[model samples]
Target: GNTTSSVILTNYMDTQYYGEIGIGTPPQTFKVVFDTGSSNVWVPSSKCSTACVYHKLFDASDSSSYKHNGTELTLRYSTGTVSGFLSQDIITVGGITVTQMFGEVTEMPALPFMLAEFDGVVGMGFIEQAIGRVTPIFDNIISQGVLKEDVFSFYYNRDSLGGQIVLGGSDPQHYEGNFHYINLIKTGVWQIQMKGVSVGSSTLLCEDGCLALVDTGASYISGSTSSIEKLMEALGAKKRLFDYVVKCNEGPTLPDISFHLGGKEYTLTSADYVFCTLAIHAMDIPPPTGPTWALGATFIRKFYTEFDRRNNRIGFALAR
Candidate 1:
């Protein structure tokens, strides 16, 4: 195969994203925002049409291993509602093995209140979307540099099992306290470029320098709209904690939801946070609002991230 396998191009997945993906059974789960720009891997299709409320349906006829080249899709998002179509099967991830890799099959109808129970979305930040074009698994790992150029990192953890995206190389022992690195503000939507935000343990002021979407597939944690009203007025709190537990001091006390990256400087606590049992029963979207902040895994669990599509850069530390 190419005389003994050789592939590792770069430029960082091309650049363009929108997340969510994890499909049916067998330890099968998907959390996507890996949009190298655009290229295959889509979800939400049980033929769709009713029983809506935060979307989650991918029954490809009930996954007998799926395969439907009957093709079709229409993705587009700025506010929300990305299209889907085109299909095939046998797509196991992380452990790698992408057979028939170029898939998207959604059951449209305005995306059922926006991806909730997610089983679809793996953008990677730049391949091609808004209608068509797919095949971006880091463009086959940066066309095939595979880590020869080196330099790639990321660490995610919001409590557990929501971390690890290391590509090139890094592990200075998972950092120790004094870190800051930012400058990943792509426009296609794998955002990052803020200046400020604060929550937990009060101190209000959750909005400034916007354009953020550091989503590790969003298990629950989002911001935008004056950054969720200055992080609930610095947690003077009053969105009524149903599943959105904004309580504090479970062990870590609070205060330290800082950011900078690219300029290097980071902090996020309040038990590494993750709220919204359903954004108020179902996407009522009440919390931090702004020009950015749409993260997940409650801000990547804590850290251990690494994604080097040959070398576009996204590193992190602190993951013990």
Candidate 2:
């Protein structure tokens, strides 16, 4: 039988969106960020320190179906690092349930997550990127015949906290126009070759082509230093500390930045690129070094995205 669910997404600090899910037999709920950059499901555990005080932690002892995997895990992100032990439990998301292995965070460093609103992250990347070679939740669902199709889609409201992650099939009501598909260049990450980027009509940010990582967990877009500097220069933005700032008055008149991928072009205007409001104007920042560019929430918010695991491809369309 085919099953589908429309999981609502909650906006967090204008950086990322998260959703709620149930764990264990009786189903203790936990709010987790859906991240495509990695393949791991981790949540705060009762053994964690005060760092996880704000969020609810998973207590294995409270669940009758909990299995102790005992595998230690440590993950390092651009913003923080998490260390924990592994466990097996029934994870229920949007009504579909699957028994999967996930991390129980015992140690969380003082990073961006310490002050964040969500409890943990539920990675939705390839199985190869999953920690401990464990089967990913989606794969488990497919193998268990819990879904009609091995596909999922994301849609975000550009202005509000409204968004949904459709599991098993695409929701046409969430998007408009035609779906543009792009083959995933490689596994482990949802990356593709970006043909080029342009500012308005004149300057080309990068024409040699660069890898673009589509990270749903990311709050802002990131790129190389030179490319960011060029983009900043074109936008007439100034660097204040680590953040690039521009005049609030220019926000309405700023030119749109266009990105070309797989021969198709998508553009982000000042409203999409601007991270903050009137006084706290800032642009997206690049990582010190890593992927050439990142299509973060700034881009995802403007387009409906689909991750086709069965075909190893990605699809995008204008969000409704």
Candidate 3:
């Protein structure tokens, strides 16, 4: 039956989410980050000898369905970049299987990629941000007439556990709240026109038109340096060696931050991002292209998120 299918994601310290996916014939198993921010699927190749040697290698020779594309790929992630080439094979996610094009990395920045919990990243994003113009994972399902719907949902468990990713459907067990949705601004990434960002009376940013990227791939709730500084000053949280904190407050002031999207307000308290000791909450960075903000782990963990391709919108609900 082509009913909805789901993949159980693995959590790493509540900051990252990963799921197991099989690529190639006989399906070599690998754990990957199901990223919504970036678009591309890449894993380490047997030829890799650097940081990749520490993880499972994708041996193309082992797969009967492997086809060489050989176009050098240089994918630049926010944290770093990876250099590889394109390869085509059958990829299996949950129970649905489809032939796809992906990258086989020969090298990447050693620090994070070497220390990365998952072996690779598989992008479940829009086509504009993709490589090779190959039909993405979910689109293939629609073309093959294998799914009842052309949508997917993400449920990220907070604090101590992982969550689930339902392909071509939504999960009732994870969310009991009605979906609050907003139309995407374009046909590119999961982007929307931000109405406003505020902390009580003060308008931190976005007085008029601003963009917000709903990313599940990245783990930051960040904005421009000017806006971030204003937030820090408002919260009375200071910078330490790496991140900003409120000095382990017993009853912290914890100024509440809220986002006004599509005339609807979603308020977020300090607890939304703050954790205990050595809590890696957020990092401040300037706008990526223009004045933009990213709602990542801080927002995703607070809401059950669904990406709707058919309707070109994004939905958020209270995560159980």
lDDT (Cα atoms) of all candidates against the true structure? 0.47, 0.80, 0.78
Error of 2 at 9 (Å): 1.3
Which 10-residue span in candidate 3 carries the lowest summed lDDT?
Answer: 276-285
Kindly give the stretch of ten consecutive residues in candidate 2 with the minimal lDDT sum. Answer: 276-285
> lDDT, candidate 1, residue 136?
56
Collision count for each candidate, in order? 80, 1, 0
The local distance difference test score of model 2 is 0.80
Q: How close is candidate 2 to the true structure, as a TM-score?
A: 0.93
Candidate 3 whole-model C-alpha lDDT, 0 to 1: 0.78
User: Which wins on lDDT, candidate 2 or candidate 3?
Assistant: 2
Residue 221 C-alpha lDDT in model 3: 74
Write candidate 1's Cα lDDT for 212-239 as tens digits: 5565544445564445655654543446
- Note the residue pairs that clash in candidate 2: 15-219
RMSD of every prediction: 15.4, 2.8, 2.2
* Model 2 bad stretches (over 4 Å): 159-161, 275-289
Superposed model 1: Cα runs more than 4 Å off: 1-32, 35-40, 43-100, 109-120, 123-139, 146-152, 155-215, 221-241, 244-271, 274-296, 299-301, 307-316
